[PDB]
Amino acid sequence: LTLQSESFQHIVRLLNTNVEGKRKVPFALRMVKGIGIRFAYMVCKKAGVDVERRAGTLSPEELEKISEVIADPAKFKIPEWFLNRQRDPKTGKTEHLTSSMVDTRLREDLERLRKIRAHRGVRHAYGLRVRGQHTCTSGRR
Amino acid sequence: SAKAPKLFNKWSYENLQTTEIALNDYITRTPTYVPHSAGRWQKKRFRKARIPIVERLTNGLMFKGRGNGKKLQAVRLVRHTLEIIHLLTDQNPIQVVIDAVSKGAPREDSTRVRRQAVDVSPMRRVNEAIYLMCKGAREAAFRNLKTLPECLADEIVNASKGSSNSYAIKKKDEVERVAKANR
């Protein structure tokens, strides 16, 4: 019920993504690739940001705090079973991918399977379903 | 001792009249406490005319597939509607409902027999008034900021006043105009 200030920004630039300022903080962070609804609530809790504020009226100090949590979730006591990319097939490390590293890593996975000519790699290259679905009547593009 | 029932313990049935004498025998004003009776009103042909008038309005609010069978929710929607009606008109809400029902359906209609103009029985006039008012409110509240109880209150108040902003009144004029121009 407080008055809107001059510094309210309708567009918030965060992790190379345009985030709407009219949304609540957990549901504005979800616009970043790699952050869902469940992950966005945990990031706000660990960063000390109240979840009942709007995405605008977020000071630069709070934005740097949110970026630190996203970069290194394990430092802030986020369990390993809560992250995507839990055991990299190439490096064996547990991380969390965000902000177009999701797309780069997905592209690498497809090329890895195609190089050794696995069945899943073959079906990806042909543009077909890969999870055992029937294709007689489903797709119909 | 026992006092007369009041609807939602707030509105009395003491002074209620039907100006339209044609529909007097088909609008039922027996006092009740709540619009919920769970009776067998469809066993005989004309038995449904004795359902209390507010309960007839409640029964018309559970129509679509997602609304079918939800009587308790419809009772809550009607309860808030009556409070808005009382504030808008400063009269007894039950009286305003009766006036809307008595003025919301056409008296002349056209039937395929070339089409011919015929007259409408009192039972159908009461049935059609409730049907048209509920449909007008349901369609107005879809994909809208306004809530359902406000749409129903506005529809009922306009119909009682005879205004053309009501969905029921606009439909009534068009049907009667066609019947006149027909024959």
Partner: protein, 142 residues
């Protein structure tokens, strides 16, 4: 000092409500252990309270009413409780009172709602093969 007590029942769909009415220091109505005026849906509280307001509270002066309900959904259970209380006050006036007062109470109940004293006989209809329900048939294609 002798105990005055009766026991009646009411039914609706598959719900059975048993009410015991006894002479007590003060009137008290409890349904499944929670007092009336605490029944959360006010619509259903008004339905059950009809068994008292229709005849008047001066007939329930010093009577304790304890009701146990088992067997169906919430709405059908409220209509069973409503019937058990109304029949309980009639039974308590048939015995320990005379016929003139019992007849006066009964006619007030009957002129308001028949189902306060007479059970509704409707029940679910069985399902038959080749139908999705009691009456809905399978879709034809041509």
């Amino acid at each position: 000092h002798t105990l005055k007590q009766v026991q009646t029942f009411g039914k609706k769909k598959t719900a059975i409500a048993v009410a015991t009415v006894t002479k007590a220091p003060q009137c008290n109505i409890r349904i499944n252990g929670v007092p009336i005026s605490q029944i959360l849906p006010e619509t259903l509280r008004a339905k059950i309270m009809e068994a008292v307001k229709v005849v008047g509270a001066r007939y329930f002066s010093r009577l304790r009413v304890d009701v146990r309900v088992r067997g169906s959904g919430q709405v059908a259970q409220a209509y069973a409780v409503r019937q058990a209380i109304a029949k309980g006050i009639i039974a308590y006036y048939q015995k320990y009172h005379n016929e003139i007062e019992k007849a006066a109470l009964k006619d007030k109940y009957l002129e308001y709602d028949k189902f306060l004293l007479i059970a509704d006989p409707r029940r679910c209809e069985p399902k038959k093969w080749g139908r999705h329900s009691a009456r809905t048939r399978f879709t034809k294609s041509y």
